[PDB]
Design an enzyme around this catalytic site. Sequence first.
Site, PDB file in Angstrom:
ATOM      1  CB  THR A 136      -6.635   0.925   3.042  1.00  0.00           C
ATOM      2  OG1 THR A 136      -6.806   1.287   1.680  1.00  0.00           O
ATOM      3  CG2 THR A 136      -6.933  -0.558   3.572  1.00  0.00           C
ATOM      4  CB  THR A 137      -3.388   2.457   6.672  1.00  0.00           C
ATOM      5  OG1 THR A 137      -2.902   2.139   5.406  1.00  0.00           O
ATOM      6  CG2 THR A 137      -2.535   2.649   8.007  1.00  0.00           C
ATOM      7  CB  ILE A 155       0.503   6.517  -0.434  1.00  0.00           C
ATOM      8  CG1 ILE A 155       0.596   7.944  -1.205  1.00  0.00           C
ATOM      9  CG2 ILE A 155      -0.566   6.633   0.650  1.00  0.00           C
ATOM     10  CD1 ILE A 155      -0.643   7.881  -2.085  1.00  0.00           C
TER      11      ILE A 155
END
Lengths: 291, 291
Positions: free
Chosen positions: A44-45, A203
Amino acid sequence: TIQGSIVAIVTPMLKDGGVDWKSLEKLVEWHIEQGTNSIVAVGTTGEASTLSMEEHTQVIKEIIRVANKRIPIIAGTGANSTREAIELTKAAKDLGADAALLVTPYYNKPTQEGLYQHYKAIAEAVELPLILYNVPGRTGVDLSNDTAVRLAEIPNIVGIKDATGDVPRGKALIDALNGKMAVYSGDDETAWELMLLGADGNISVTANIAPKAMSEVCAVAIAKDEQQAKTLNNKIANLHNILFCESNPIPVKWALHEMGLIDTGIRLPLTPLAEQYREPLRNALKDAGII
Amino acid sequence: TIQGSIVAIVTPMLKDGGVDWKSLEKLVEWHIEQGTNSIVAVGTTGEASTLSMEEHTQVIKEIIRVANKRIPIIAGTGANSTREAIELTKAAKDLGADAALLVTPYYNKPTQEGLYQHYKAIAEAVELPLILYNVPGRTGVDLSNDTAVRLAEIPNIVGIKDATGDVPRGKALIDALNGKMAVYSGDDETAWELMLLGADGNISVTANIAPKAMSEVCAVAIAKDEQQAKTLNNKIANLHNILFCESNPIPVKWALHEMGLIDTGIRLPLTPLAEQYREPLRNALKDAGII
Ligand SMILES: N[C@@H](CCCC[NH3+])C(=O)O
């Protein structure tokens, strides 16, 4: 076994939105030297949503190449289609990634049994260690502790990134399992507590800008040093809060830019952090001695 | 401006998951004969997320082929990537689609400004009438009424599918728009209410199994006949509720199969309707007069 501070690394881009390879390179190298224990590529990042299937591969590849078997690398390969998640994970294995992080199908709200079939299907189809990823706010689905426990039985489903930020629920999950499968925090703000309670690492989004500080927080928390964990984390607590003032990775990508590490690039629908938040961020990076 | 009952048609599948083209042809044909005013091809109810890009175009093409210009066809072309959305909208236009339906980017939580820039870009790159589609529960993002009113300024953004099911919110949406763009209900249960309030139609799931019923419900409601609208809708009101006992399209697909109209096919992560629900469904169907 993959333990500690796992950075969910951003995918650096040029003003025109092209993948800025070199800047990426400097990041991987920088992370490997600052302490970061491992990297999640194209999650996502790392804007997995706005990168072509070929940019996924190319980006995952560059990172594995630059890492050079020094730290394990995890590839983001989740998708809301099963046939397609199977393809991405396969390509991840074939590229020699150490593991795959798969978010729960988003948007189509599959049932728990479906989530079970989805993950089981992929595990049987690809011979690689898979990590489940739950983040209901973004996906529309909530993988239940029960279901996660059900999947923990599959030998190559080795972990789950719990982004709920719900600590009690997280402890319940850790206890309900045994080292059946690892649990990774997905909520920077609460990660230190999750780790003190058993989680095997974090994470992190914050790790993109404070890798050494986060390495030290995870090592200390996994070791169960509650006192030092609260203290090391406190020096970077604000960051966890303000790196989400707007949807991640928007703030983290600007923070990095304000550190001369990357360029303003970021793909629509995402936009450059709004003017309004920039000084408060610069301030945040100073207060925390980052720049 | 498209008005009436707009069916979010399912994509019929054979046991092994392949698109049942014969069934699709017949469904389209059945809809035009029953009173259906328009069809949304490969939207959510049609498993857009689990269809091949090529299957995507093929389904649009087929539906436009069979309709033979008798009703307007709307193609679902939303994506969480602006580049991807533009690509898919361009294709739909080139395929002869009357308009496109674009759900707000899901999973990556773009900002309000991001949602504006996202839709403005697609509007400027493709000359096809566009319909926004807000359903926060599935997307993780909520396109506010203010943002919708901004986008309504753009010439080819003709409408917005509001699936919130929040009628008072819908009342405010319609009042604020001053007609700039049409409003469609995306919530079958409250649809007749939105239409009485000014909504131009219902992009319906229920219409999949009660096309004539939903068709007269839409006409009457749009005509502002509150008692006829209420009593006509009451006949199939239990259907609106039971077609969501599990995530759409799981229930509706099974309904069609019990109606002997399609096979049991549905792609993972989605699953065939859980056993426990199949009987109450048949009862609902029998009571409603569909079987
Ligand atoms: N937002 C969904 C609702 C289905 C799920 C309810 N269990 C739709 O109508 O597409």
